[PDB]
Short mmCIF file of C-alpha atoms and ligand atoms in Angstrom, two decimals:
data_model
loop_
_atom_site.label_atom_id
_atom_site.label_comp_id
_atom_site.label_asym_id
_atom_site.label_seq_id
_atom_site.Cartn_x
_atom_site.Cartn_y
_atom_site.Cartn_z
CA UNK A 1 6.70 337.42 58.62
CA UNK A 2 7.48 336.50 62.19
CA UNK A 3 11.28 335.17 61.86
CA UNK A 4 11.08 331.42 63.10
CA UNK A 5 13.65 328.36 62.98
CA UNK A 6 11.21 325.82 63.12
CA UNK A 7 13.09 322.71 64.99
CA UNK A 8 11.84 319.52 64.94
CA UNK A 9 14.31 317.55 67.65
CA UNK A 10 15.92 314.15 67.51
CA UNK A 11 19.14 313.13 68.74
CA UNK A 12 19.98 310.49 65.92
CA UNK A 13 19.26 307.27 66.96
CA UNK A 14 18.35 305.72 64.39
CA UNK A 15 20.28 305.56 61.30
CA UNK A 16 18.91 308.12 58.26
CA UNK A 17 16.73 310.27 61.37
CA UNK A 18 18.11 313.18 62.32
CA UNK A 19 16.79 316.88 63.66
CA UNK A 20 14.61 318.85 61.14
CA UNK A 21 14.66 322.10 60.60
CA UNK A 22 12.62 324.86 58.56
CA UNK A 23 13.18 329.03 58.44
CA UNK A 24 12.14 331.79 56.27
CA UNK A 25 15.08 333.98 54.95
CA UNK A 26 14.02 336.75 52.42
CA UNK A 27 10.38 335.06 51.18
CA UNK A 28 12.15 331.34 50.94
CA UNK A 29 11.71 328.65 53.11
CA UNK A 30 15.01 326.36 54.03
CA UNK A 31 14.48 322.79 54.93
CA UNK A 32 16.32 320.26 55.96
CA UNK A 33 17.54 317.48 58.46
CA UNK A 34 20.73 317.33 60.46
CA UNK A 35 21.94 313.52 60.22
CA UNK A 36 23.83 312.93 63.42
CA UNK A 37 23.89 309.15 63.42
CA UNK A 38 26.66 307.42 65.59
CA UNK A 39 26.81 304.37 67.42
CA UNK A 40 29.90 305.29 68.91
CA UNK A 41 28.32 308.41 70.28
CA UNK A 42 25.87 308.81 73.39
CA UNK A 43 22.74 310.95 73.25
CA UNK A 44 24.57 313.84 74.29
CA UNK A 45 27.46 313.74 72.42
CA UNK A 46 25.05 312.98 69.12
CA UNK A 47 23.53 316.79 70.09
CA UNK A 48 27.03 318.27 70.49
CA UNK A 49 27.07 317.71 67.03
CA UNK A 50 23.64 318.61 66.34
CA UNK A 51 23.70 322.04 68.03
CA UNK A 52 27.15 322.63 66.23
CA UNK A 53 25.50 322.11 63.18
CA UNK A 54 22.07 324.77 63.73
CA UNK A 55 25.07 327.75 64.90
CA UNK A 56 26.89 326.88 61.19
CA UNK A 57 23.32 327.12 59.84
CA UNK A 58 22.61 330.29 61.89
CA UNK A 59 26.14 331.44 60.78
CA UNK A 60 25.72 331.13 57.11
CA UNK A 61 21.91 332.24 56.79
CA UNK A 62 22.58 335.30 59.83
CA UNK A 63 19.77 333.85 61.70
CA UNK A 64 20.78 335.65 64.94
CA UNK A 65 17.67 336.59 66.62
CA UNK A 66 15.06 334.44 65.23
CA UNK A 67 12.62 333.14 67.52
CA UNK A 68 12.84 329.43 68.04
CA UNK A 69 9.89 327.24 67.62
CA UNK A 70 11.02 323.57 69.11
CA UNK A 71 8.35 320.86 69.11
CA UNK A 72 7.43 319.93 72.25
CA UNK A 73 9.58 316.70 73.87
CA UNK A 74 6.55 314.18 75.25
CA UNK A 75 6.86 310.37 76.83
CA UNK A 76 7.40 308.15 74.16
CA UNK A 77 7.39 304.63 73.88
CA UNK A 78 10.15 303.49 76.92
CA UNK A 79 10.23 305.92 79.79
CA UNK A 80 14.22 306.20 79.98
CA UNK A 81 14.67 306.97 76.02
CA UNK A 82 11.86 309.84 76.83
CA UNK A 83 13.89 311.16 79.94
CA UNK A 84 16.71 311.44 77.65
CA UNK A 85 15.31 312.77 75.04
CA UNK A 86 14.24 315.49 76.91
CA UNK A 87 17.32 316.25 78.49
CA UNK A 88 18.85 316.65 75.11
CA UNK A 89 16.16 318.51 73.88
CA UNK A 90 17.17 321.09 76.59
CA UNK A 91 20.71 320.83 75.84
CA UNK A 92 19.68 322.06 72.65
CA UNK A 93 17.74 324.66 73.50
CA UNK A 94 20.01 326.04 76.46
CA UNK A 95 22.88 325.94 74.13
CA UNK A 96 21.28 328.15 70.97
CA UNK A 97 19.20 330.56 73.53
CA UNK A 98 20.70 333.81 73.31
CA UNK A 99 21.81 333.33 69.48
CA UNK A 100 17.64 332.88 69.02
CA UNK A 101 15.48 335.07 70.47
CA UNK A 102 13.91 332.73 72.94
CA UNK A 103 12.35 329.75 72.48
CA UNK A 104 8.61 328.25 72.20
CA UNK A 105 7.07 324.91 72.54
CA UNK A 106 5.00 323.65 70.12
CA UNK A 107 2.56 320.94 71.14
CA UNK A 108 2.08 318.63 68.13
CA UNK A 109 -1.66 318.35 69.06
CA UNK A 110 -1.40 321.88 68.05
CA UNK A 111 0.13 322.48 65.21
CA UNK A 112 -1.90 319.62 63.59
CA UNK A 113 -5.07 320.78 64.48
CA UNK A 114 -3.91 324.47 62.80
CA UNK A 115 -3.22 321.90 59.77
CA UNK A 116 -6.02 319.73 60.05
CA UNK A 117 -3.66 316.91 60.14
CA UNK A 118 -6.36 314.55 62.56
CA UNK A 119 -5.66 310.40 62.86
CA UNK A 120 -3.52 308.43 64.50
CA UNK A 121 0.34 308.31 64.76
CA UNK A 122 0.95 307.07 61.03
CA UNK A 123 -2.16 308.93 59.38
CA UNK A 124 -0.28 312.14 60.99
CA UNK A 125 2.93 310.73 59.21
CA UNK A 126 1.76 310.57 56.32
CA UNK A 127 -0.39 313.68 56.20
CA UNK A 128 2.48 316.07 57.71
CA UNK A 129 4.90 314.39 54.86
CA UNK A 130 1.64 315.02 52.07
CA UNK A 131 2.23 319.17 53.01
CA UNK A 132 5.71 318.93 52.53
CA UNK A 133 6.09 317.27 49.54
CA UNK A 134 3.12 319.23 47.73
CA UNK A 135 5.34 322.49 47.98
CA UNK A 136 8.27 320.81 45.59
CA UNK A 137 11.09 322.05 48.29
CA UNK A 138 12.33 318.27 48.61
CA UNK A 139 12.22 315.37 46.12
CA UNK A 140 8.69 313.57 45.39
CA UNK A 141 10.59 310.47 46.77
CA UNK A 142 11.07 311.92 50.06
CA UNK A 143 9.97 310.15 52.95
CA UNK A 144 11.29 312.19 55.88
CA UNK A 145 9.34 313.16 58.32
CA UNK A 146 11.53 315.06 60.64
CA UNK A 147 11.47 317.49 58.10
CA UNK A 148 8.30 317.58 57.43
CA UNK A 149 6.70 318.25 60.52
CA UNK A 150 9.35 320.94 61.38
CA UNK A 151 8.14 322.73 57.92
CA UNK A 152 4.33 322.25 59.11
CA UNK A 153 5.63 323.69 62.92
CA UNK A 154 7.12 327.21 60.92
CA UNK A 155 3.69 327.55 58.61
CA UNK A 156 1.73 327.76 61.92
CA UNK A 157 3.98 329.81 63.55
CA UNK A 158 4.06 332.76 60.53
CA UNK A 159 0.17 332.29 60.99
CA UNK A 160 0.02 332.42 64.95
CA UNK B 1 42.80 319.03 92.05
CA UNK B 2 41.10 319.73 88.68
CA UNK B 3 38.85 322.66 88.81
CA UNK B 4 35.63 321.55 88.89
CA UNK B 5 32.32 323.62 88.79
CA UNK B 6 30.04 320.84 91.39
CA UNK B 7 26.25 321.29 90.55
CA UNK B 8 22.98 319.95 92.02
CA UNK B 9 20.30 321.44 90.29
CA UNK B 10 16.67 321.65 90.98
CA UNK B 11 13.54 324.44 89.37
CA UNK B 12 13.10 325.57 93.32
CA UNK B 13 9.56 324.35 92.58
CA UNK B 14 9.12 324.27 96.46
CA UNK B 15 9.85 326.94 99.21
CA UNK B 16 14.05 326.50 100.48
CA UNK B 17 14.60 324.59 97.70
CA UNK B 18 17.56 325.35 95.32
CA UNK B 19 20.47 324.98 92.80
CA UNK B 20 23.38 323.65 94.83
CA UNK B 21 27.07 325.00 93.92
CA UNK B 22 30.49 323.89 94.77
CA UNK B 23 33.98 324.69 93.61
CA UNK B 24 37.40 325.57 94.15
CA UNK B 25 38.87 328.95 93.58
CA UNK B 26 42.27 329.69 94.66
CA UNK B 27 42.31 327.17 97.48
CA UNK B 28 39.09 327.82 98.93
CA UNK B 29 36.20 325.69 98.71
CA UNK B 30 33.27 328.28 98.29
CA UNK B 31 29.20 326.52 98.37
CA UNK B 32 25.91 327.89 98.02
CA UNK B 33 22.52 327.46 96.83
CA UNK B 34 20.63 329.83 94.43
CA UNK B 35 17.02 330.16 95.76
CA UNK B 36 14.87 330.19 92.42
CA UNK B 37 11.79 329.54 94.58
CA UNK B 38 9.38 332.09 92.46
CA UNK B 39 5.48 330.81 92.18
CA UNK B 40 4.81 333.71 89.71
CA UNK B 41 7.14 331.43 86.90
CA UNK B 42 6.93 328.16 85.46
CA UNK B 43 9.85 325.95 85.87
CA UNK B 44 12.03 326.85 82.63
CA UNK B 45 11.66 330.65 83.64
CA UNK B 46 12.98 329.57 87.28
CA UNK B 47 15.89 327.77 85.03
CA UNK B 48 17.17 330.63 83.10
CA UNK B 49 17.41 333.05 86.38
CA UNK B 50 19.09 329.95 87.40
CA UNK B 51 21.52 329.76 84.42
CA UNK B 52 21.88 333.94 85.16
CA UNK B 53 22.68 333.51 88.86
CA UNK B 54 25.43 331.14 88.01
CA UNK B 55 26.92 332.72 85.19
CA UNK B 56 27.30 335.60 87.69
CA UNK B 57 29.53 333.33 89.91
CA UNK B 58 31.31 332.18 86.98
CA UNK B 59 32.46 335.62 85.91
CA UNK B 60 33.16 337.00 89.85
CA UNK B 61 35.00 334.06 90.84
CA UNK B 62 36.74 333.65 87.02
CA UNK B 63 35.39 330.79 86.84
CA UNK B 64 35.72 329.82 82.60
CA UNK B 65 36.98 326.58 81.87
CA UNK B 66 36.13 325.01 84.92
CA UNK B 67 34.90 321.09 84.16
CA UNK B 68 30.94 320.76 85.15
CA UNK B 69 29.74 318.12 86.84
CA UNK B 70 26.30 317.89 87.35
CA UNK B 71 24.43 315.18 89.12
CA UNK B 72 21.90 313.00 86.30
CA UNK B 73 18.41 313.74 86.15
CA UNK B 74 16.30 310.64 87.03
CA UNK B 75 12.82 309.34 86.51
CA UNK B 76 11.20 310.18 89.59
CA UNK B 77 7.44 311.39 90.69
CA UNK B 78 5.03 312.36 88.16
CA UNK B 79 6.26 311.29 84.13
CA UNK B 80 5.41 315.22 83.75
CA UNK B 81 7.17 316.55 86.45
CA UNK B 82 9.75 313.66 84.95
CA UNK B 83 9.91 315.33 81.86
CA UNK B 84 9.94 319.17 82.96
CA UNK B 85 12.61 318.32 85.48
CA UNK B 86 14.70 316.49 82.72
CA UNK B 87 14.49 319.02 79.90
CA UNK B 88 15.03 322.02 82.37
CA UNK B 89 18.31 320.06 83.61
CA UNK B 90 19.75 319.98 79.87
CA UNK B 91 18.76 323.45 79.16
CA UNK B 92 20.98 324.84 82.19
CA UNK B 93 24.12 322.68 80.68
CA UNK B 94 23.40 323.72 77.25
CA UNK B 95 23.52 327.31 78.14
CA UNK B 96 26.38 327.01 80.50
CA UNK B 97 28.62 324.60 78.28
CA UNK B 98 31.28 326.57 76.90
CA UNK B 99 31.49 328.69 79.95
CA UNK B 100 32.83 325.47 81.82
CA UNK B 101 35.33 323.55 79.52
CA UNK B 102 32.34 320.66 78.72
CA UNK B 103 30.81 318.70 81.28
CA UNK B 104 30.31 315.40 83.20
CA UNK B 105 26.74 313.40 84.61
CA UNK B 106 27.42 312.53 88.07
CA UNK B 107 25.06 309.49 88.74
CA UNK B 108 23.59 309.95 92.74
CA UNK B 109 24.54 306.55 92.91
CA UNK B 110 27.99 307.02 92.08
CA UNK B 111 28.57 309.81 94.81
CA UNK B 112 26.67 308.68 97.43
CA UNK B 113 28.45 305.30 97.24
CA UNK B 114 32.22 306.67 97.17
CA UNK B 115 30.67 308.63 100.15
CA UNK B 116 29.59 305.29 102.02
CA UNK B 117 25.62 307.63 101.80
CA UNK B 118 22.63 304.54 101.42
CA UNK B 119 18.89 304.60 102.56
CA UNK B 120 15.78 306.16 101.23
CA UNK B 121 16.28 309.89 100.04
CA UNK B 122 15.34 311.10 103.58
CA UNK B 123 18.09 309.50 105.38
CA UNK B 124 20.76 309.92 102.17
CA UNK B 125 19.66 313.60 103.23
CA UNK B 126 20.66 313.78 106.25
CA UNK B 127 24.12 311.79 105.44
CA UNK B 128 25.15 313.71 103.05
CA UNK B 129 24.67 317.18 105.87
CA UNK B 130 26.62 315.65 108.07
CA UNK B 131 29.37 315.72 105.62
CA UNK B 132 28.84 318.65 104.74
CA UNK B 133 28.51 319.78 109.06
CA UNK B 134 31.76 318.21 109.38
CA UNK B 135 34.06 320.47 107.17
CA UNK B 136 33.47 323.50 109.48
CA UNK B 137 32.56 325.14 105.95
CA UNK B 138 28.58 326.09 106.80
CA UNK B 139 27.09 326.78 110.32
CA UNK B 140 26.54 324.16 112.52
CA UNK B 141 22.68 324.18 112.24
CA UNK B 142 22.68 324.16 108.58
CA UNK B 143 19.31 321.72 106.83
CA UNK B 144 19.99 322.46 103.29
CA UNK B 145 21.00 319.24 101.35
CA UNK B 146 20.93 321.35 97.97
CA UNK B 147 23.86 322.36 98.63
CA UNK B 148 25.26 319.41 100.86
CA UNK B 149 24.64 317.02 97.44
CA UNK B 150 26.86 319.56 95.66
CA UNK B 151 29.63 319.69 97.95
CA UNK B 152 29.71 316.04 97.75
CA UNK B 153 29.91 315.64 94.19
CA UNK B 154 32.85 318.25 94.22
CA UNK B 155 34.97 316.11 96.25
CA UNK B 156 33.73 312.92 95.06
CA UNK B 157 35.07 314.34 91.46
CA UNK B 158 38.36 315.85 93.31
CA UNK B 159 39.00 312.02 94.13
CA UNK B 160 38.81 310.53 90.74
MG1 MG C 1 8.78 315.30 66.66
MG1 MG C 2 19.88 316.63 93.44
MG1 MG C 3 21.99 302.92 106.67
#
């Protein structure tokens, strides 16, 4: 298959968000989602951490020259939280490029379409967290969909 | 003095425009621009040979652990060009972070205040040139305010 880290970005802001992540390493998928909540951290420092945290993941699985697929940073719901979010989404990228092969962005009109996942912004939720769950690789319970949509991001890439 | 790696950056999205430099090596305040301008690439391609050109200074001039300082991205024209702008900004201090010894966001405001600069960005232009003019460091006929803003910033940061 095409060897993809699947990145879905957030810098933390919220308490139990975080950056999710999916790769395929010898026929099995890894999933997961870095938790890099601090209120006593900025942005910034919040992916410090984060990109610390993919290189110990790269480290341990020897990722080193996987192609990264990052989900494309768009204006959200406050302009200045957007700006911000996509200068840390570049921080991140900037900072792995060279230890991934390059990098792609990955509209999530796109990837949903490949999926069918079609509605509005909590349909899409829902549907993106329906995929992940059906494949048993978290907990039935699970209702994280940074995850999610960065395992849905990697399943359109191996296709692509 | 602590030795600090002044940058203005910009994509070159526009002919003359260009990633302003200015630091300190052994005494000697050395300034430049790196003139990306390159219609045949989209902005993050204009980045990297950005993040290339100055990690060629960095090595020639033995230039590791040097502090960045880097003026803020703000929200400006189009929320695209916004965006692009913003997440093409973080990926040049991801990729250059560790190179320099971490980095600091140098708010225009900040600098242009210490330097007693004010107007609209036309005549901040032009104020900030005739600082630059005034050093003797660049011919007397010099326009470019790429690398004036990062000249500023360097001694704006010498001063704190
Ligand atoms: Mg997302
Ligand atoms: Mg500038
Ligand atoms: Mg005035």
């Amino acid at each position: 298959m095409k060897k993809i880290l699947a990145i879905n970005f957030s810098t933390a802001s919220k308490k139990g968000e975080g950056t999710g992540y999916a790769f395929r390493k010898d026929g099995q998928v890894y999933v997961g989602s870095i938790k890099a909540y601090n209120p006593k951290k900025t942005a910034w420092e919040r992916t410090f951490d984060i990109v610390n945290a993919i290189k110990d993941i790269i480290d341990e699985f020897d990722l080193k020259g996987y192609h990264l697929a990052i989900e494309t940073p768009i204006m959200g719901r406050n302009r200045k939280h957007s700006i911000t979010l996509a200068n840390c989404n570049g921080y991140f990228i900037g900072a792995i490029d060279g230890l991934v092969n390059g990098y792609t962005f990955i509209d999530n009109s796109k990837w949903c379409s490949y999926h069918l996942i079609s509605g509005k912004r909590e349909q899409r939720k829902e549907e993106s967290l329906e995929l992940l769950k059906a494949t048993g690789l978290v907990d039935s319970n699970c209702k994280d969909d940074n995850i999610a949509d960065a395992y849905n991001i990697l399943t359109y890439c191996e296709h692509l």
